[PDB]
Amino acid sequence: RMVIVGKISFCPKDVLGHGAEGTIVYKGMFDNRDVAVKRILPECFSFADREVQLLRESDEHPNVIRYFCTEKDRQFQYIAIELCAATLQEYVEQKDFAHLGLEPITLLHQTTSGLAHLHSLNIVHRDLKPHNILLSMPNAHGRIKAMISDFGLCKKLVPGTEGWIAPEMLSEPTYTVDIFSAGCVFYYVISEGYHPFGKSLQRQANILLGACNLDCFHSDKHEDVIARELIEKMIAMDPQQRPSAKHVLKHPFFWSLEKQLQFFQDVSDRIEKEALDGPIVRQLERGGRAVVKMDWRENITVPLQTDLRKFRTYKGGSVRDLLRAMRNKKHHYRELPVEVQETLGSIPDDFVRYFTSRFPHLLSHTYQAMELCRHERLFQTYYWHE
Amino acid sequence: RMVIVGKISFCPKDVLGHGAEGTIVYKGMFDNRDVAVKRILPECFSFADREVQLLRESDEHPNVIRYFCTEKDRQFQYIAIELCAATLQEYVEQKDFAHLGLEPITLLHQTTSGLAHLHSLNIVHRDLKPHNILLSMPNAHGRIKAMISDFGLCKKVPGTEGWIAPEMLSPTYTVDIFSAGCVFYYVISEGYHPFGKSLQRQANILLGACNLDCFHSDKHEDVIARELIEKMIAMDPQQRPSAKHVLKHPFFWSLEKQLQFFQDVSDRIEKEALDGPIVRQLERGGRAVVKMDWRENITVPLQTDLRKFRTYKGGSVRDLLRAMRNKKHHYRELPVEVQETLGSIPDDFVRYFTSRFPHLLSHTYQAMELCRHERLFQTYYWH
Ligand SMILES: Nc1ncnc2c1ncn2[C@@H]1O[C@H](COP(=O)(O)OP(=O)(O)O)[C@@H](O)[C@H]1O
Ligand SMILES: Nc1ncnc2c1ncn2[C@@H]1O[C@H](COP(=O)(O)OP(=O)(O)O)[C@@H](O)[C@H]1O
Ligand SMILES: *Cc1cc(-c2ccc(N3CCOCC3)cc2)cc(OC)c1O
Ligand SMILES: [Mg+2]
Ligand SMILES: [Mg+2]
């Protein structure tokens, strides 16, 4: 038994899900495309059409959901939205969600970028949760994309939802609240379900308390060291400590394998032809022996060490010698003994994974100690300024 | 085996139909809605995207279909357009068809309004025909509407064997007005073409040969529809009316509109001398339309009641119209017998009189062309 309320339309029996404060989402229609229609009480939730229009008038971003149209029933409010296949919950939780075929880390790239698109428009979500990060229906060749939804709306008379509210929002808003929320959903995605804060009932209590677990992030694993390093700052209690929408996009956490490798190359080149006394080099061996595992030479595979023994001239007590060795080996890769190629290669995936496997703090240490050269013409693909 | 050439997508197994000169149309996708994608060879047809872009940058007309986006394969050209239910063909010829939902004259109306909107944009369809008028899939509350398609593209002679205005063989909107005339007949006739069967169609059109066999002269609606289509399929390009002129024609009027015309005219003609040029023009056709004496060509209750006042000449058009208007006005206080024969207003009533004087509206219309500029007669007449 269908309803109209013209310019939008739906059937009430096809209900998708109930939201906060008595709002309901069904599967309706529009032109003829399948749509999710969100039906809202105007006294509870407050749509702000101005922001949404600004979204429309500006260049369409691929990871920020589009609102079809808005009309005000007497006692209600009606929104027609691209029917998505699921929310982030189905993704990380159901596990059966046949991707396809996107990685969680690109998922977070998408999300953070879309969010950044919002923040460029000086627009803040106020309620970033796994339910407000939706997944498209499969596209042409079957690929899936992630968009943020439920933006530009709020509550009259605290916004957001229990569990995903920043600390400072609960003590008598800018982008930072969205960056905190985003850190949480990052952990929720990476950690296959666990919340950093950590159980449902205690979650927000610990948010104000400052309790974090993060126990999924070992210290002997590269990717975990990176993830931890970023999320640590995203969910920092001090809102001034939280990284901006773009800043997060620029993190090593997002880099491709090739990008990490190239990072190691570039770094090795730029540190070469400068004195050991210089600021950069001295700083690069600041953490020193720690990351290298004392001497890097014995901590690597056999053939590689036979070649290196044949050539070095490589202290091993230095990270810089390691970097330089990696750059040399990457460069001269093709003209190397086939066994060496077998252990190292292929470039760049297996190559760089071969070193970050064995030195989990290498990329991190290099990246941080090389912040000095952040302004140089080469490193703007790597670092942020303002 | 899905095809991409993004952003469009289709299965070459779900073909909807072959087109002209190799082009074909399949049921494809876009965002996530079903669409129809027709592929063309860019070596045959030349798209003018300035026109379609101009369509986009102008007001959305409910009867002009929309081409979603245009893009080029290396070897092909792809157009994705709103997926429709059928063409005029299935509308007319498929005996078990759901309109649902829409009358044929409302169909033609829609078609002509979309057509007029196109013409307003200084774009000429160049190829009007049934396949190029389409039926939409049911909407919100089920209602089907009709949209015109395949406009804005041409061939590297435009048109189609059967519907091509003769002077294009020996272009302006007049061509579309002519093709439109053809489709008007085609629709109203429930299957027939004026010119009139397939192979001779274009021979007979260069000839000037018309059929119009299904339009009698004893049925009012026939006389009107004919009166228009004739002017639409006139072999002289400057004779055919403009796309809006076609719309303003009595053919499209509602019954309320018709009876309102009759009353307005009857109020106007009155208090003007009988030698007067307007009234004299009105009685030029005279007897023939009035059937000698209109008193004798109505029901017996009405005439036995018209006896009591007349005053009603009966050979005269003005007097019939004025009797209509007077009996209309004083309807409340008429005997139940007379009320009953006339039937409820305006439907049964204006039909009561149009039944018996099929030429009456056509005649009064043409005769009242005299006062076309008047501020009361503008809802009826062209400018
Ligand atoms: N755009 C959408 N498309 C499809 N399903 C949706 C959409 N938005 C929400 N849903 C589903 O409907 C439910 C209600 O969502 P919503 O009204 O946004 O409140 P909340 O933000 O608390 O989930 C959600 O759990 C989600 O699973
Ligand atoms: N939007 C549409 N929806 C469904 N079918 C269509 C559509 N457009 C065209 N067709 C089908 O494609 C066939 C021919 O394609 P086209 O070149 O557009 O028409 P024609 O060749 O008759 O001018 C028609 O007979 C019609 O059935
Ligand atoms: C790993 C590594 C490799 C070289 C090196 C490799 C290959 C060449 N050539 C030039 C002559 O032979 C053909 C290819 C030269 C040098 C050098 C170093 O550094 C000593 C090194 O670490
Ligand atoms: Mg939501
Ligand atoms: Mg067609």
- CATH code where residue B302 lies: 1.20.1440.180
Contact B23, B39 (CB under 8 A): yes
Q: How was this structure determined?
A: X-ray
The amino acid present at B111, given as its one-letter code, is T
Give the number of A-B residue pairs with CB atoms closer than 8 Å: 29
The reply to whether B309 and B290 lie within a common domain is yes
Q: CA torsion B4→B5→B9→B13, rounded to 10°?
A: -70
The reply to whether B215 and B100 lie within a common domain is yes
Atom 21 of ligand 3, nearest CA residue:
A328
The three-class DSSP label of residue B77 is: strand
Residue of B3, B9, B31, B32 to mutate, testing the A interface (most A Cβ within 10 Å of its Cβ): B32
Give yes or no for A372 touching B (CB within 8 A): no
Q: Which of A29, A137, A140 sits opposite B9 (nearest CB)?
A: A140
The reply to whether A119 and A225 lie within a common domain is yes
The three-class DSSP label of residue B42 is: coil
CB contact under 8 A, B2 and A140: yes
CB contact under 8 A, A4 and B31: no
Resolution value (Å, 1 decimal): 3.4
Neighbouring CB atoms inside 10 A of A89's CB total 16
Nearest one of A262, A331, A339 to A304, comparing CA atoms: A339
- Residues of B within 8 A of A32 (CB-CB) are 33-34, 82-83, 137
B2 bridge partner residues: none
Sequence-separated (6 or more) residues with CB below 8 Å from residue B283: B316, B317, B318
How far is it, in rounded angstroms, from Cα A38 to Cα B213?
57
Which helix (H) or strand (E) element contains residue A355? Answer: helix A349-358
- Residues of B within 8 A of A6 (CB-CB) are 140
How far is it, in rounded angstroms, from Cα B16 to Cα B83?
10
Residue of B4, B5, B10, B33 to mutate, testing the A interface (most A Cβ within 10 Å of its Cβ): B33
Domain range for B229: 83-254
B110 backbone dihedrals φ, ψ, rounded to 5°: -50, -50
The reply to whether A96 and A73 lie within a common domain is no
Structure tokens given for B221? 């609606």
Q: CA torsion B250→B188→B181→B49, rounded to 10°?
A: 110
Sign of CA dihedral A135, A137, A143, A145: negative
Atom 20 of ligand 2, nearest CA residue:
B19
The reply to whether A285 and A248 lie within a common domain is no
The amino acid present at B235, given as its one-letter code, is M
Half-sphere exposure of A81 (CA within 13 A, CB side): 27
Domain boundary among B254, B276, B299: B254
The amino acid present at A340, given as its one-letter code, is V
How far is it, in rounded angstroms, from Cα B24 to Cα A121?
44
Angle, CA of A60, A66 and A69, to the nearest 5°: 125
Give yes or no for A6 touching B (CB within 8 A): yes
The three-class DSSP label of residue B300 is: helix
How far is it, in rounded angstroms, from Cα A206 to Cα A184?
13
Which helix (H) or strand (E) element contains residue B39? Answer: strand B34-40
DSSP at B193:
B
Residue with token string 């005029």: B88
Ligand with an atom nearest the CA of residue A304:
3
The reply to whether A233 and A329 lie within a common domain is no
Classify B15 in phi/psi space as left (phi over 0), alpha (psi -120 to 50) or beta: beta
- CA-nearest residue to A6 within chain B is B140
Nearest one of B259, B266, B192 to B225, comparing CA atoms: B192
Which helix (H) or strand (E) element contains residue B49? Answer: helix B49-56
How far is it, in rounded angstroms, from Cα B15 to Cα B24?
8
Q: Judging by DSSP bridges, how do beta strands B84-87 and B77-82 pair with one another?
A: unpaired
Contact A217, A225 (CB under 8 A): yes
Sequence-separated (6 or more) residues with CB below 8 Å from residue B121: B51, B54, B55, B58
A293 backbone dihedrals φ, ψ, rounded to 5°: 65, 55
The reply to whether A282 and A137 lie within a common domain is no
The reply to whether B51 and B21 lie within a common domain is yes
Find the CATH number of the domain harbouring B15: 3.30.200.20
Contact B229, B317 (CB under 8 A): no
Domain boundary among B17, B47, B82: B82
How far is it, in rounded angstroms, from Cα B178 to Cα B231?
9
Find the CATH number of the domain harbouring A246: 1.10.510.10
Give yes or no for B142 touching A (CB within 8 A): no
Contact B193, B230 (CB under 8 A): no
**Which of B49, B73, B96, B127 is the catalytic position?**
B127
- Residues of A within 8 A of B9 (CB-CB) are 140
Which numbered atom of ligand 2 lies nearest the CA of B150?
18
Sequence-separated (6 or more) residues with CB below 8 Å from residue A132: A87, A125, A148, A149, A150, A151
Q: What is the largest CA-CA distance in chain B?
A: 84
Classify A113 in phi/psi space as left (phi over 0), alpha (psi -120 to 50) or beta: alpha
How far is it, in rounded angstroms, from Cα B330 to Cα A296?
112
CB contact under 8 A, A32 and B4: no
How far is it, in rounded angstroms, from Cα A165 to Cα A182?
10
The reply to whether A249 and A324 lie within a common domain is no
Contact A241, A179 (CB under 8 A): no
A360 bridge partner residues: none
Which numbered atom of ligand 1 lies nearest the CA of A161?
22
Neighbouring CB atoms inside 10 A of A166's CB total 25
The reply to whether B243 and B354 lie within a common domain is no
- Measured in whole angstroms, the distance separating CA A36 from the mean position of its chain's CA atoms is 27
Q: How many domains does chain A divide into?
A: 3
The amino acid present at A297, given as its one-letter code, is R
Contact A169, A135 (CB under 8 A): no
Contact A359, A323 (CB under 8 A): no
Q: How far apart are the first and last CA of chain A?
A: 56
Neighbouring CB atoms inside 10 A of A170's CB total 12
The reply to whether A262 and A364 lie within a common domain is yes
Give yes or no for A44 touching B (CB within 8 A): no
Domain boundary among A256, A283, A304: A256
The reply to whether A278 and A330 lie within a common domain is yes
Contact B349, B342 (CB under 8 A): yes
Q: How far is the CA of A332 from the centre of ligand 3 (A)?
A: 6
Beta strands in A45-92 (DSSP E): 45-47, 67-71, 78-82, 86-87
Structure tokens given for A192? 């296959």
Nearest one of A92, A84, A61, A77 to A24, comparing CA atoms: A77
How far is it, in rounded angstroms, from Cα B67 to Cα B60?
12
CB contact under 8 A, B83 and A32: yes
Q: Could you list the active site residues of A?
A: 127
